[PDB]
């Protein structure tokens, strides 16, 4: 009833390559909360071209 220490330790190539539909859909609270330095630094062409007003 124990684990065979010499069993297959590799990764089964014929495993599940799709996405798990029941996986975590929530937002991860302890994720990256800082800004990204290599984000988009250029102005947006399709931004607001009018007044506030």
């Amino acid at each position, epitope marked *: 009833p124990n684990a065979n220490p010499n069993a297959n330790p590799n990764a089964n190539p014929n495993a599940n390559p799709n996405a*798990n539909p*029941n996986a*975590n859909p929530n937002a*991860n609270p302890n994720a990256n909360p800082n800004a990204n330095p290599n984000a988009n630094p250029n102005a947006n062409p399709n931004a607001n071209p009018n007044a506030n007003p």
Partner: antibody, heavy 123, light 107 residues
Framework: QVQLVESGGGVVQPGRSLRLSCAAS????????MHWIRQSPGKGLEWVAI????????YYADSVKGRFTISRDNSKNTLYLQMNSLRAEDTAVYYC????????????????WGQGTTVTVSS | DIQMTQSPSTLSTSVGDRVTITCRAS??????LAWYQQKPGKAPKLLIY???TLESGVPSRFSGSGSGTEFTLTISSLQPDDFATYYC????????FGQGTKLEIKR
């Protein structure tokens, strides 16, 4: 506490379209995935659709795939379901539901259900 | 598509009784099973997830058991607020609900 309010249901002729909405309050709506689940006397409880917190992944039941479209507006804290090409068997009470918070590798389902809105497809 | 089946469909019981309802899946769903309670004309409420974890706020007289393909929900001592319909739901592969068991007041 958590509160979900459905609206938009009513009587619709077969073949027409209908848009259901679900207003969420009492929690950070943009942080949670949502389900739409319907209930009819003939089929019982029946899952319809699921959407990720950011809308990146959506899934649909096989009986509705290609006809229903689930979306969300996180700026308005509103969940939407656009239903096209309605058939008679789609008459049911539709609930929106909130996914519970869990561990990163667990499977997920819903913990809080909305009030429910009735949709009647009849000519 | 995993089929779910609940037994019995209707159970006549009395206040104070020990109630046990069963739920079976067409294939192995591990422990990813939830139990929902629904009162008539009202929205369903979550009772148990992972087949045996009690939802916060649920009284301790509710308990879950089971693994693989057979699962049971047990109410140790029935109280009048517990007369409702109970649905099981696998969430191992998409989401499918059982037909539901309605607890009826025996007289």
């Amino acid at each position: 506490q958590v509160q979900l309010v459905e609206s938009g249901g009513g009587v619709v002729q077969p073949g027409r379209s209908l848009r259901l909405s679900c207003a969420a309050s009492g929690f950070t709506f943009s942080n949670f995935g949502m389900h739409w689940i319907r209930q009819s006397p003939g089929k019982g409880l029946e899952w319809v659709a699921i959407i990720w917190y950011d809308g990146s992944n959506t899934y649909y039941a096989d009986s509705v795939k290609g006809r229903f479209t689930i979306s969300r507006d996180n700026s308005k804290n509103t969940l939407y379901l656009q239903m096209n090409s309605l058939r008679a068997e789609d008459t049911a009470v539709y609930y929106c539901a909130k996914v519970w918070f869990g561990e990163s590798e667990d499977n997920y389902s819903v913990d809080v259900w909305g009030q429910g809105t009735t949709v009647t497809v009849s000519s | 598509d995993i089929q779910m089946t609940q037994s019995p469909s209707t159970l006549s019981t009395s206040v104070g009784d020990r109630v046990t309802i069963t739920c079976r899946a067409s294939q192995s769903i591990s422990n990813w099973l939830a139990w929902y309670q629904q009162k008539p004309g009202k929205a369903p409420k979550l009772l148990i997830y992972k087949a045996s974890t009690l939802e916060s706020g649920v009284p301790s007289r509710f308990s879950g058991s089971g693994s693989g393909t057979e699962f049971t929900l047990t109410i140790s001592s029935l109280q009048p607020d517990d007369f409702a319909t109970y649905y099981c739901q696998q969430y191992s592969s998409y989401w499918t609900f059982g037909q539901g068991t309605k607890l009826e007041i025996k007289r």
